Amino acid sequence: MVLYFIGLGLYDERDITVKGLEIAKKCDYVFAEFYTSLMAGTTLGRIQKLIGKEIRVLSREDVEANFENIVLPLAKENDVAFLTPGDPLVATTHAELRIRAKRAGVESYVIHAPSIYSAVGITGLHIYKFGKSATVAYPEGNWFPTSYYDVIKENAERGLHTLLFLDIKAEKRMYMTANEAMELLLKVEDMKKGGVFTDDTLVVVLARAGSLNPTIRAGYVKDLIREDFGDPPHILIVPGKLHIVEAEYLVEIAGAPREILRVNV
């Protein structure tokens, strides 16, 4: 009689909220997608075990093209759940799926879960200081995406931090590293020459947020562009103007160069 959008969280199967688990356990059918993000600390098997149900994984086409044919039909006579990494409606187009549910006469509910969008708070950067977000997409063919560069520029001149989601090709199992994101940005800088992202730009890297020991590193591009941040997923952040307390955290916790403590008022 209902459809639930349930987030699974950041890293492993235990990142689902208690609410999400108790509800998922009682559903008649459970579907899921794992192409919008990467949960590096678990497996489908462990999720199924925890929920105690067989999970039917859908592909991007199954969802985008046939959600109303594959999932909604069952939701009319049963309690159905749709699982996703992180929070189901963050940096996805899943929100529109609720419209499909309504038109199909199916009531839907949303159960949130930890999202990278807020987990960035672990970098020590004030969340309210984050501006517009963007995604660094893999160039393909003669098409080289550059919009994310402009976002950084706009945020930076307002003194705001920029959160950069990194590209993912789930089927090909390719997860863009912070290193690759930095390389691509230097190329865009060369092309546009706006003085937005260079070897001296301070950046922050967060890898495998949600794990007990995520990698949190801060430093200049010249020094981090070749550093090993561990397995994906990775997120990249270009800080804006720092508050002393932010810099203080980047130094003490993320091992940033102590010179950043000296902020130019």
Q: Which residues of this chain interact with ligand SAH, rule CB under 6 A?
A: 10-11, 36-37, 85-87, 90-92, 115-117, 165-166, 168, 206-210, 233-235
The answer to whether the annotation marks 75 as part of a ligand binding site is no
Closest CB 73 distance from ligand SAH, rounded Å: 25
Pick the closest to residue 40 from 192, 191, 229, 200 (CA basis): 229
Name the binder of 77 from ligand SAH, a second copy, none, CB < 5-8 A by kind: none
* Distance separating alpha carbons of residues 36 and 84, to the nearest angstrom: 8
210 binds a second copy (CB under 8 A): yes
Listing DSSP states for 169-181 in one string gives ETTTTEE--HHHH
* Distance separating alpha carbons of residues 77 and 264, to the nearest angstrom: 63
* Distance separating alpha carbons of residues 217 and 203, to the nearest angstrom: 8
Q: Are 108 and 5 in contact (CB under 8 A)?
A: yes
Name the binder of 36 from ligand SAH, a second copy, none, CB < 5-8 A by kind: ligand SAH
The answer to whether the annotation marks 166 as part of a ligand binding site is yes
Closest CB 40 distance from ligand SAH, rounded Å: 7
SS3 at position 63: helix
* CA 195 to each of CA 154, 157, 178, 183, 192: distance values in angstroms, whole numbers, following the listed order: 12, 11, 20, 15, 8
Contact segment (CB under 8 A) with a second copy among 60-68, 177-185, 195-203, 209-217 equals 209-217
The answer to whether the annotation marks 209 as part of a ligand binding site is yes
- List the structure tokens of 13: 């199967």
The answer to whether the annotation marks 133 as part of a ligand binding site is no
Residue ranges that bind a second copy, judged by CB under 8 A:
7, 9-10, 12-19, 21-22, 50, 86-96, 98-99, 102, 109-110, 112-115, 117-119, 121-122, 124, 126-135, 154, 158, 160, 165, 209-210, 212-213, 245-246, 248-249, 252-253
